[PDB]
Design a protein around this ligand. Sequence first.
Ligand SMILES: *[C@@](O)(C(=O)NCc1ccccc1)[C@H](C[C@@H]1CCNC1=O)NC(=O)[C@H](Cc1ccccc1)NC(=O)/C=C/c1ccccc1
Length: 301
Amino acid sequence: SGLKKMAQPSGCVERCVVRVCYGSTVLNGVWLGDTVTCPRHVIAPSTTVLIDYDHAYSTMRLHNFSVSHNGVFLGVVGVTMHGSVLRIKVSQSNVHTPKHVFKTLKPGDSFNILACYEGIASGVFGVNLRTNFTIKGSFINGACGSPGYNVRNDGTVEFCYLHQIELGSGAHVGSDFTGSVYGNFDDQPSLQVESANLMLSDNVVAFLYAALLNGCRWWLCSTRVNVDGFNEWAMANGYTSVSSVECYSILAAKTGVSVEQLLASIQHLHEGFGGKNILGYSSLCDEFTLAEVVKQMYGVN
Ligand SMILES: *[C@@](O)(C(=O)NCc1ccccc1)[C@H](C[C@@H]1CCNC1=O)NC(=O)[C@H](Cc1ccccc1)NC(=O)/C=C/c1ccccc1
């Protein structure tokens, strides 16, 4: 039993990370085959004023790159720019390149961030892409380029995030590997503020199924609320819509509690826990996808 917000093992990704230097600026790159992808502001001239990236890229000289890994040398052959990322071609093909694909996160999706500095993985943690296209992460200076990823069952790494910026709120933004910044924020020192963050209802439902299956039932209401009724309530209260109730059929089954009843319970529980806890949490928790709960409670053989 238990529910921990865990990260998929980081090993396959650790060996794809590299230090990318331009001038004196240093951040992380993701080396797959003979390409290091990395955030493009490694070439930015300065933080305070708006950056002409077109100009920076046209005036960018290869001789000021230095791409290393654990002290070893990767040569730069050339550099293209694609949205907010550079694709640095390099002389060696990363022998540790994993079977991978590039995949763009929708909000609600969960993924793993490997926090890296100077091309070295320092930490790993799970996180959800929020409705406002930010994540709540922990990144200090030098964390840009830290990759985010998921790993499928066939061992396939889905590379889906490259850390780029921290908004004034503390919320974190990155791009996918095509260079599209999540939520169409700009990788500039500008004043951008994120929309309001909604509670990811689906994840709250899965959380509550998990609580049930871990013998935590005190909160459970005898009220039922249908999907349309819930969705309407949600808009008014800072919550997302809830997906088809059939998604949860396995957990409905195993607990004998319907989504409808959990949706209702969500509404009462919105008002506070009264000093009680649900699996340790003191307010409702949307950290966990359905898939996470199912995998964590049932997902071996
Ligand atoms: C990255 O780690 C990074 O770009 N590092 C470059 C670097 C500078 C100095 C020494 C070593 C490396 C960093 C990550 C931030 C820092 C704290 N937490 C983070 O997530 N990114 C930034 O500092 C960026 C830099 C930048 C990018 C693009 C254009 C200009 C500057 N800046 C910001 O995150 C703050 C800009 C901002 C954006 C919106 C609203 C307010 C402020």
